[PDB]
Design a protein around this ligand. Sequence first.
Ligand SMILES: O=C(OCCN1CCOCC1)C1(c2ccccc2)CCCCC1
Ligand SMILES: O=C(OCCN1CCOCC1)C1(c2ccccc2)CCCCC1
Ligand SMILES: O=C(OCCN1CCOCC1)C1(c2ccccc2)CCCCC1
Ligand SMILES: CCCCCCCCO[C@@H]1O[C@H](CO)[C@@H](O)[C@H](O)[C@H]1O
Ligand SMILES: [Au+]
Ligand SMILES: [Au+]
Ligand SMILES: [Au+]
Ligand SMILES: [Au+]
Ligand SMILES: [Au+]
Ligand SMILES: [Au+]
Lengths: 215, 217, 215
Amino acid sequence: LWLGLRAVLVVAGLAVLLQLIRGWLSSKSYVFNREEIARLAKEHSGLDYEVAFSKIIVELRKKHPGHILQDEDLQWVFVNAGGWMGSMCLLHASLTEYVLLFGTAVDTGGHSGRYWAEISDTILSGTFRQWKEGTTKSEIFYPGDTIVHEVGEATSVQWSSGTWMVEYGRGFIPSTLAFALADTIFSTQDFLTLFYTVKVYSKALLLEASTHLSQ
Amino acid sequence: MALWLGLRAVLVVAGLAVLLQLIRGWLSSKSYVFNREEIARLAKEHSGLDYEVAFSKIIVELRKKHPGHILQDEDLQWVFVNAGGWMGSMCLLHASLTEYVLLFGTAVDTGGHSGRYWAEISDTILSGTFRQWKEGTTKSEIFYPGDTIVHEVGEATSVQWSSGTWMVEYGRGFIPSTLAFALADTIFSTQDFLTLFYTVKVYSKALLLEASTHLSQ
Amino acid sequence: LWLGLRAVLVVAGLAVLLQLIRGWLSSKSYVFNREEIARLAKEHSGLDYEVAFSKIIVELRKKHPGHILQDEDLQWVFVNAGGWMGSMCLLHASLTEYVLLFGTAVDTGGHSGRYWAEISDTILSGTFRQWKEGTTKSEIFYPGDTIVHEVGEATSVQWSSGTWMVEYGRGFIPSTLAFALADTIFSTQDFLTLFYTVKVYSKALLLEASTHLSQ
Ligand SMILES: O=C(OCCN1CCOCC1)C1(c2ccccc2)CCCCC1
Ligand SMILES: O=C(OCCN1CCOCC1)C1(c2ccccc2)CCCCC1
Ligand SMILES: O=C(OCCN1CCOCC1)C1(c2ccccc2)CCCCC1
Ligand SMILES: CCCCCCCCO[C@@H]1O[C@H](CO)[C@@H](O)[C@H](O)[C@H]1O
Ligand SMILES: [Au+]
Ligand SMILES: [Au+]
Ligand SMILES: [Au+]
Ligand SMILES: [Au+]
Ligand SMILES: [Au+]
Ligand SMILES: [Au+]
């Protein structure tokens, strides 16, 4: 039964880690909230998305100091996943939450991805077409609306050539990195972008670790 | 004995050569259930109604003229399909080792590679638009409800669909050869393994139903 | 430290092979130049791109005999990379240069790819949307314009259903085939197109080598 030792060790490891992480998510104090980020974006969902980005980043650093990356650690990184292409401006990220500014300047679309995280996007500009699984009709969302991509749900997304939004996710963030980097490995082969994504995600983790040490 | 390093290589070449003649001889001596004109005619008769109403009447007509070969309503579900760079959904009605009939379409604007496989495929558009770009050309053609696109064996084209395109599709050949292309984006791009499970689920039910019909006959 | 011998040989092998190629590219006599191809393509940037294809091939074979493939060795080969799909007509190709006619008859777009080659495209018809890295707005280019994709640059490309262009690239051409065939391996699995791409690239390499033997 020695050959089965490896198979038992992974099943026991996955079952223990599944209860360890799920019990952590149900007992962890969270920094941001899905309604908090959506409300913040709706305050400026009339202005220019560049003007909205500035006022949103300023308001986030006031209400949650020590949790948003500095302007020195901010950069627009391309994101290739599920067949669509966009760019992100990661403001905050931990092992359980993340807040970023996502959007695209071209017409893209594809698979939303199925992972262990609840994702909410509040559109600031452009349009957002969503196709839920098992249906034959899609819905188009406009600036001001908030789309909630629930955990375990898989939909089809599509954006116009000027769509920008504010996004908040909660769950187990590392579970999404397999889907977020799939097209970067097998399609674009833009390993420099792969480096940028790990770079800014590590800075957000080190910043979050630095805040817990001071408290 | 130089045949030791070549033992795996010869067995695969011998295995492929034996399997190639056994499958191609089967396709030339097997009685087929459906017909390429039969599915296309049935879909074109309902290409003026709403595609949801057309789906219902086509499934009824298929179960009337071909009982025991179309899945029951309990075993039907819309499964996402990501392949060649496009994304849609299918409703597998019938499928065997040599034929398959399903309802495919998309609610978004997608497009990509049609895939090159060992199966002749015909699609009759019920709604939306269908742009096809054949290999070796510099211009594309747009197909409208009522038209039928024939994707011959070994042909590779570029496909593109509008945000409301739905169609009835029939394929004949060696169906397992197409599953390698149908699941490529599901493995390397979307990683939606639950959809991968659904595809294997609905394709197995169609095989078990078709096998269940052969046992009673 | 015995197992680190392979790792040192790889670091020394990659660093030395980088110096030899980069120093070769910076001191090598080239056949074509981007301004030569750009002027030739801009003169024929009209509506009838098929007539433009013929007139460009004739002019290229006059001023550069023995460097452009004959009509017998020409075929339109599909190109799937970065999420977009088009077709190419390889006219000239070496280890450092290539001249081809690229375009698409459908609406595609995706990652431009980051590789070791400077690429310039002069639009003959259609439209070309380029989304530079780190920005939030994209630009649309029209027939007559020339887009220069420099080495190490990564952008988002998008084309309309009638875009055709003349392209010239210079750098390390074998480094670009890894990106050009990525989607063909992991998405389309069109092994026949993979054969066509290697076939026409081999004929173009053998043609360029055949001219060096006669000279
Ligand atoms: O930044 C992202 O992409 C937002 C776009 N959204 C739009 C629709 O819902 C899913 C993704 C993701 C990320 C990237 C990098 C770090 C952490 C997260 C979010 C997880 C899924 C994709 C990659
Ligand atoms: O369900 C499909 O996709 C329909 C779309 N049509 C549209 C364009 O031409 C090819 C397929 C396919 C399938 C997948 C799995 C089982 C049975 C069939 C058909 C074969 C080629 C792709 C995958
Ligand atoms: O032929 C091509 O594709 C042109 C399309 N362009 C359009 C935008 O910029 C990058 C590619 C490429 C090639 C393929 C085969 C041989 C030599 C070159 C050029 C390098 C990058 C992709 C593949
Ligand atoms: C590649 C083909 C694109 C079609 C050209 C017309 C539309 C492109 O124009 C786009 O319109 C949007 C507002 O409407 C803007 O947000 C985009 O920045 C602009 O590029
Ligand atoms: Au930024
Ligand atoms: Au920003
Ligand atoms: Au269904
Ligand atoms: Au159905
Ligand atoms: Au050609
Ligand atoms: Au040509």
